[PDB]
């Protein structure tokens, strides 16, 4: 369980993206999750469509609300297309999955990490990236243009992102905003403080598919 875990230089995460004026956090976080695992075994890095997840997942409320843990489940159940055969537009619409044709990616299950346990988060993040939530409605996290976020912030979780590494002290997160935020679309939050919930409630509820 290395002292350092970066999947970027591991060839697991692709360039950064933006959800835009679309409250669709959840589908983006997922595509990165599934994505990671998909490349971890096969040795093939891919960019899947979040747009599809939006238009297809009726359980989620597309362009403004969702469950990073429906998306995944969805995929495993059905599947998910490339981000070319289903590029992101930013507006929820009619499911094209079927109309689009044969799927391209399809997992083999979804599991959740025991909330409120850093030790647990890491491990999984060590075996493969994960979808995690937190407080973004933040007025500080909103302004982050590079650094180690300690706060201030709260325990009112409401935005989903992704963890793509950690250090002895900083946890790495991929944001669904442009590369005109944090440190090039990236933000480092601090771990090991005692805060069980985890600063910004980053330890509330996390997840991930399964792959054979």
């Amino acid at each position: 369980i290395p002292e350092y875990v970066d999947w970027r230089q591991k060839g697991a995460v692709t360039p950064v993206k933006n959800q835009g004026s679309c409250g669709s956090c959840w589908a983006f976080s997922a595509v990165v999750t599934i994505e990671g695992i998909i490349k971890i075994r096969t040795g093939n890095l891919n960019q899947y469509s979040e747009q599809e997840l939006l238009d297809c997942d009726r359980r989620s409320y597309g362009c403004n609300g969702g469950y990073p843990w429906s998306a995944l489940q969805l995929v495993a159940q059905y599947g998910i297309h490339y981000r070319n055969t289903y590029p992101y537009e930013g507006v929820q619409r009619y499911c094209r999955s079927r109309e689009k044709g044969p799927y391209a990616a399809k997992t083999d299950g979804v599991r959740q990490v025991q909330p409120y346990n850093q030790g647990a988060l890491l491990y999984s993040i060590a075996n493969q990236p994960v979808s995690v939530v937190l407080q973004a409605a933040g007025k500080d996290f909103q302004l982050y243009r590079g650094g180690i976020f300690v706060g201030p912030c709260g325990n009112k979780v409401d935005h989903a992102v992704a963890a793509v590494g950690y250090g002895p002290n900083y946890i790495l997160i991929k944001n669904s905003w442009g590369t005109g935020w944090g440190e090039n679309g990236y933000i480092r939050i601090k771990r090991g403080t005692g805060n069980s919930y985890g600063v910004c409630g980053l330890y509330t509820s996390s997840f991930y598919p399964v792959k054979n």
Binding site: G23, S24, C25, W26, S60, Y61, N64, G65, G66, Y67, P68, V133, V157, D158, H159, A160
Partner: peptide
């Protein structure tokens, strides 16, 4: 509630 749903994450936006």
């Amino acid at each position: 509630a749903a994450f936006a």
